[PDB]
Design a protein around this ligand. Sequence first.
Ligand SMILES: [Mg+2]
Ligand SMILES: [Mg+2]
Ligand SMILES: [Mg+2]
Ligand SMILES: [Mg+2]
Ligand SMILES: [Mg+2]
Ligand SMILES: [Mg+2]
Lengths: 140, 126
Amino acid sequence: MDTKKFRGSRTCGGGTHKNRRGAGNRGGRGKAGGCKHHFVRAMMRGYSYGKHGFKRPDEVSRDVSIVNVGELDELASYLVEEGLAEVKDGAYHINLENLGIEKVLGSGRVTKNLVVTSEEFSASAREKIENAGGSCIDAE
Amino acid sequence: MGKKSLVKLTRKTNPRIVSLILTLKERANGDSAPIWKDIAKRLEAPSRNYAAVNISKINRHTAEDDVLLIPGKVLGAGLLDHPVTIAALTFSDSAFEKITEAGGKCLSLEEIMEANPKGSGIRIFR
RNA sequence: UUAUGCUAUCAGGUGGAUGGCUCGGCUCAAGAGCUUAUGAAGGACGUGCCAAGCUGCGAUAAGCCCGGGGUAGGUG
RNA sequence: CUGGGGGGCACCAACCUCCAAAACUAAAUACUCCUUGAGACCGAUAGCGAAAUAGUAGGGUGACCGAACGCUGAAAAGUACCCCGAGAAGGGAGGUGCAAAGUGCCUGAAACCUGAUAGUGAUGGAACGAUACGGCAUGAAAGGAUCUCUGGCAUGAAGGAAUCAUUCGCGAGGAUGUAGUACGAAUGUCACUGCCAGUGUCGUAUCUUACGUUUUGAAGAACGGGCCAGGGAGUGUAUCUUGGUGGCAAUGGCUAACCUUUUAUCUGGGCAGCCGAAGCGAAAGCAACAUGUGCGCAGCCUUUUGGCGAGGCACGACGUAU
RNA sequence: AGCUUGUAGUCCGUAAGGGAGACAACCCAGCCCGUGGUUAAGGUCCCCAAGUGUCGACUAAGUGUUAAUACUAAAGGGCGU
RNA sequence: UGGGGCCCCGAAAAUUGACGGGGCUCAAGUCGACCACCGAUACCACGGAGUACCGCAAGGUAAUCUCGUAGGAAGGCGUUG
RNA sequence: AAGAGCAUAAGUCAGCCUGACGUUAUUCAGCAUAGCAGUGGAUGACGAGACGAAAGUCGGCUCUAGCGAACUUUUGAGCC
Ligand SMILES: [Mg+2]
Ligand SMILES: [Mg+2]
Ligand SMILES: [Mg+2]
Ligand SMILES: [Mg+2]
Ligand SMILES: [Mg+2]
Ligand SMILES: [Mg+2]
């Protein structure tokens, strides 16, 4: 706190000089007082007691990266500019495994012709891709 | 401009903002146009809560050949379809390239206040 | 000439604050890093012309011999 | 060896991978008795306990605890000779030195003690003082000279009489007129004068039963302080949350260890990694509006009444869990 | 019971200044500094600023001379007036 | 005979003593009225400071701003480098 | 228990039945105003029924008491 603000105040913003003794003016040390006298604060902070669910090992689980069709469509010109994509006979041939994306979602609009190869496709993503005349290949 | 606005002015450090605020109030008195006084009171707000406008919002709301005052920074995210004039406080480089490719202009607040004395048709964005 | 006293200032005593100075302390960094039965570190006692303490030294006892550097004084 | 082990519960099968129960091995790293360098470090009650005759004096049977003490001057030039005194004490006179700085000797505060000066004082009542008026003492510098003192004239806000006359009342007195007059804080102006401001102490009038704290309540017969000087109390690392000011900005932001260091700075590299970008669900898993409608502030246009209306609010639609 | 526990308003706590003999919380008043003026509460014999004030009666006990109040005596009687 | 005002008896406590004290009797007491004056920092006037809000500034408005403990916020002074 | 409610009835008797049902959302009081479990009580929604010509009534016994978090074990349906 601002020490110079309190030169000549005695109590230094604490009230009586009987406050600020030690751990008993805080109710215990740490998150102490779980549900006897700090129960309401315990519930509001996000420290409620309980155990709920299980965990799978991290060896087997994976966290897929995603990209929506709108995002993939809008930045296609920049992708071919960087040499990532390819523009043979007009339709963009864009491969998602060189970027680092394992699944294509479907939020947004698609207007350009896209030939997208990847591992996974939501149903709506495939519907939107092929309603614009494009094609999707399950990359293996 | 009581002591309140003087305090809010004293907090600022960047000289260009201070010069803008003073000149905007002067020009507002000169032309009797509340637009400049409004922009001054906006620029005099907390710096945490300024405006950051993406290209998509301008494309969504404006029309062909509008004039725009953005007391903040224009960010480049989206696609710009039609020519627009966006006189803002600052542009990012991608935003500048997109607006130039579309065929618009990117002129600072000084240029817009000098060219148009009254703001007869300016649209404030946020 | 009102004594014993009270208040304020001045001169002096006692005292050792303040200021100025400081071969000391502390912290960080870069180096360097074992020694002793061929008797170590540490201790007791002694050792000076006048010498009590500390420092050095050991009955050859604030010391002896050789090689280099240094140059006119030396005797912690 | 046609063998054996492992692949996060046991066994079977496939696949992948290794060869224990013997042994050695530089460099990158840790530390500071010690040597060198540097310092937004302390400056003698501080900094190590020790500016070291300091682990000493001293204290304890012992394990062990543990202080205080810096400074003449440029040069000792460290007070010759004379008088007093019992004097190798000490004093006086007289010298040295820019200056006594006269030996633990730079400067030399306060408490405390001795003397002098001013006020007061042996008929007198107390939180030791604040305010106004007087006596006595001082008032050189740094404070005043249309300033100090005494008067005249002009304007004067709120307020505002005395005196006399008429009239009412049992009476104390009231009302009207004289009169909103004569005066009135102050504001200007013309003469007059040499003091005033300030400081000490005493007297008169009004007021006040100290200060910090605990207390519903303190002058308390509640606690603390004899006095003076010095010392003496919200600081750093990690992490979470939130303001004021900034850089960059979905083609996002920042680098960490380290290398280039030419001595700790600095310039340029360093994409490992962290946060943001998609959520829901215990999990398997699945995977959304890049605007469909309305009300409307600011601002702009306008017949000053309406219109457009970013942000804001309210809907509608969709992802997932149940 | 100056006791204990409730409730409405206002206060002390944290509230100067004026008046009550002194009075945490009772009456007037809620307060920046300086000067002039008129009033509030309360008072006007002296202490003490301003009435030995006016009109009509009562008391003879120094009764009384004490807004509220934790500080002020009752039943009963009197051919006292 | 009944209803009222004042007073008397009923009425005894320990240091000396409390209408605040002196004292007060057609009152300096009690009851019902009345007149004049005194008396705050209240209210009025003048000058000055600060604050709140507005205004580009100059400046403008304040009967509807000026108490304060725990405590929140803003601007300044000082010590060493 | 105490208080409140009830007459072609919320009381007495007879006939027929099991709504003393599975799942789920708000609002009220516990806990005026003004945060606080679990858990209860009033309106509803989905799926099945009983009685009755139908309207309707039925989420026990006219209304307000008869009860307990996390962790742990056991049991039921289906999944990870
Ligand atoms: Mg020391
Ligand atoms: Mg208290
Ligand atoms: Mg001190
Ligand atoms: Mg109060
Ligand atoms: Mg008072
Ligand atoms: Mg305070």
